[PDB]
């Protein structure tokens, strides 16, 4: 359903995400999905859709279960990104960050500043 900054921070930390990255991740999530896990974003101009809490693109990162060509660089169904369990979205988001950086998110431009500490979450 819907996370809050801290619940998401807590879960991602739990999943192995460095606290250092959490203000950024949660900023991204707020911008991308308002923390909603089950969102498929509006169709992009190229016919793709973004999936899940981090709005991961179904052309590059996950495989549409509808058969649509994808690079599926995260090696998962896009549906896997819509689950209440953010594990898949977290791993995939982390892989994307690893490959293309935060800059892979359009919303990064909002999230690249001096974000508040995540410490209040712990």
UniProtKB/Swiss-Prot annotation:
CDD domains: LYZ_C_invert (cd16899). Coiled coil: none annotated. Its EC number is 3.2.1.17. The active site is at 32, 50. Belongs to the glycosyl hydrolase 22 family. This is Lysozyme 1. May not function as a self-defense protein, but as a digestive enzyme, probably in the gut of the insect body. Inactive towards Micrococcus luteus. Active toward glycol chitin. Residues 1-122 form the C-type lysozyme domain. Disulfide bonds join 6-121, 27-111, 62-78, 74-92. Keywords: Disulfide bond, Glycoprotein, Glycosidase, Hydrolase, Signal. InterPro entries: Glyco_hydro_22, Glyco_hydro_22_CS, Glyco_hydro_22_lys, Lysozyme-like_dom_sf. It catalyses: Hydrolysis of (1->4)-beta-linkages between N-acetylmuramic acid and N-acetyl-D-glucosamine residues in a peptidoglycan and between N-acetyl-D-glucosamine residues in chitodextrins. GO terms for molecular function: lysozyme activity. Pfam families: Lys. Active at acidic pHs. Inactive above pH 7. Glycans are attached at residues 46, 85.
């Amino acid at each position: 359903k819907t996370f809050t900054r801290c619940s998401l921070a807590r879960e991602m930390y739990a999943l192995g995400v460095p606290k250092s990255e959490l203000p950024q991740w949660t900023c991204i999530a707020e911008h991308e999905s308002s923390y909603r896990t089950n969102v498929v974003g509006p169709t992009n101009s190229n016919g793709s859709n973004d999936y899940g809490i981090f709005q991961i693109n179904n052309y590059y990162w996950c495989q549409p279960s509808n058969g649509r060509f994808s690079y599926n660089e995260c090696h998962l169904s896009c549906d896997a990104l819509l689950t209440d369990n953010i594990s898949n979205s977290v791993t995939c988001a982390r892989k994307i960050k690893s490959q293309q950086g935060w800059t892979a998110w359009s919303t990064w431009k909002y999230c690249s500043g001096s974000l508040p500490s995540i410490n209040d979450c712990f």
